[PDB]
Structure formats: C-alpha cells, structure tokens
Amino acid sequence: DDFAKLEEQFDAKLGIFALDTGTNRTVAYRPDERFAFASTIKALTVGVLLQQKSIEDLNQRITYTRDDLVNYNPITEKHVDTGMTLKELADASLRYSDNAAQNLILKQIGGPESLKKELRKIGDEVTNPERFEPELNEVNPGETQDTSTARALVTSLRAFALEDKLPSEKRELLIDFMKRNTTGDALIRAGVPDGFEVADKTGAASYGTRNDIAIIFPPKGDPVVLAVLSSRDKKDAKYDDKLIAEATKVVMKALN
C-alpha cells in the first residue's frame, strides 16, 4: 500500500526489488515489471569490464575522438586529446554517469551483444543491452530493448558486487566507484538512515524513467541490494527524485 501510495502521489510506476543479504529477506513491488534501465547499465558494464581485465589491465589508455562524445560527457569531453585509462573511464561512467565513458567501455567489452552474453552467463535472462548511450534511453512502453526489471538488476548487481562473478579486489573497485557516485544524492541515498553507506548508479530515460540501483551497507549486518525503478505514462514526462528516495524509505522500513 505504501509503494502504491507513492505511485499515486508521483503519478509514476514503481519497480522495486530489495535483498537484505544478511537475512535473505526481500522487498518486492512490481519487481518483474520492465523499465528502461538507462544509466544503471553502466554499473553492470563495469562489472563485465572488471571480469575481463586484471586490475593492472585497467591502466590501458583508451584514445577516442569528439565523434564519441554525444550528449552528456562531463569527464570524457575534457580528456578527448589526451585519452583516458579504462579505470578512469570506469570512474567517469560510474561516478559521473559519463555517456562517452560508458560507450567506450561497452566497446571495450565487445559491445551491447557482449554485455548481454555476459549477463546471460551470470543467469540474468531479463536485462537486454541493445544500444549505446544515449540511444538506449529511447524506450517506449512495451518495448524490451535496453530494459530490465528491478529483480534482474538487483540479482545482476549482487552477482558482480557481492557474489562471485568478480574476485574481491575487483568487487572492491566496483563498490568504491559506486560508493563515490556523485549523481545519486537525492535518490536511494536520500532514503537510507544515517551511517548507511550507499554504492549506487542512477539512470534516467524516456517516459520519465528514473532509476537507482545500489548496494546499501548498514552500520551492522550484510549489504542490502536494491533497485528502485520508475517510469511514467508520457514520453517527455519529467521525473521526481523524491519518488526514489521515498520508495527507498519504504524498503528500509520493510527491512526493519
């Protein structure tokens, strides 16, 4: 009723899945409803990048051009002449949601097809990487291109960040990046209690799609993996971060 209340208040659809890995308790609300995953895919993309490369390997310098810079490139646009290491690209992608960073990493790992193949390998049958940024944000209701579900994103994120799709040093790298995300302050972070660490990746796409996926680290006890996905009825709809923050609060109350 609380999630439905938020949907009502924000004229939005909520997609929620949370797993407290310390109790195996779950919170679900339209967990299997598809949403354009938007930039949350960047987290899973770095996960695959990390699976593919030694930590040292991430020091490879990637040269790119202005062709690669499409819309939102806060970091990559500044280093277009000097290039960026894969690590620096991962940093930009995760922490600034740098689209060109995501695209260059996605190319590095073998493209959307390779990302999808690696997600199927980990048993994510639902996430459908098809396109680069910002093209992947163009998802209509009912279309499955570049979509996933809260359950699938949580399950996949957990696999890379917490489970065994990455060795510990790489998991730590992925977690450190997401912990130091700069784009998520008003989302999942705005809905956790004090002293809870959040490692998150935000996204926003067409139809007022506004997403945040996270691993949340309580003061005591094991991490909670959470996806809060939202979409609205109208193509050019604006989103309200407050919905994600409020939905996160409901999750945390349920897990308490």
- Determine the Cα–Cα distance for residues 78 and 72; give it in Å rounded to an integer: 12
- Determine the Cα–Cα distance for residues 196 and 192; give it in Å rounded to an integer: 6
Q: Is 148 a catalytic residue?
A: no
Q: Does the annotation flag 203 for ligand binding?
A: yes
| Closest CA relative to residue 68, chosen from 55, 58, 57, 81 | 81
Q: Does the annotation flag 202 for ligand binding?
A: yes
Q: Is 93 a catalytic residue?
A: no
HEC readout, the chain = CHHHHHHHHCCCEEEEEEEECCCCEEEEECCCCCEECHHHHHHHHHHHHHHHCCCHHHHCEECCCHHHCCCCCCCHHHCCCCCEEHHHHHHHHHHHCCHHHHHHHHHHCCHHHHHHHHHHHCCCCCCCCCCCCCHHHCCCCCCCCCEECHHHHHHHHHHHHCCCCCCHHHHHHHHHHHHCCCCCCCCHHHHCCCCCEEEEEEEEECCCEEEEEEEEECCCCCCEEEEEEEECCCCCCCCCHHHHHHHHHHHHHHCC
Q: Which residue in 39, 93, 97, 206 is the catalytic one?
A: 39
Q: Does the annotation flag 47 for ligand binding?
A: no
Count the domains in the chain.
1
Q: What is the resolution of this structure in A?
A: 1.7
| Closest CA relative to residue 247, chosen from 80, 3, 34 | 3
Which whole-number Å values give the CA distances from 203 to 16, 110, 183, 187, in the listed order? Answer: 15, 22, 9, 10
Residue 47's CATH number: 3.40.710.10
User: Tokens 């957990």 belong to which residue?
Assistant: 158
Domain containing 1 equals 1-256
Q: Which residue in 33, 77, 130, 135 is the catalytic one?
A: 135
Residues 188, 212 contacting (CB under 8 angstroms): yes
| Four-point Cα dihedral 44, 34, 230, 8, nearest 10 | -160
Which whole-number Å values give the CA distances from 137 to 110, 134, 197, 227, in the listed order? Answer: 20, 6, 28, 18
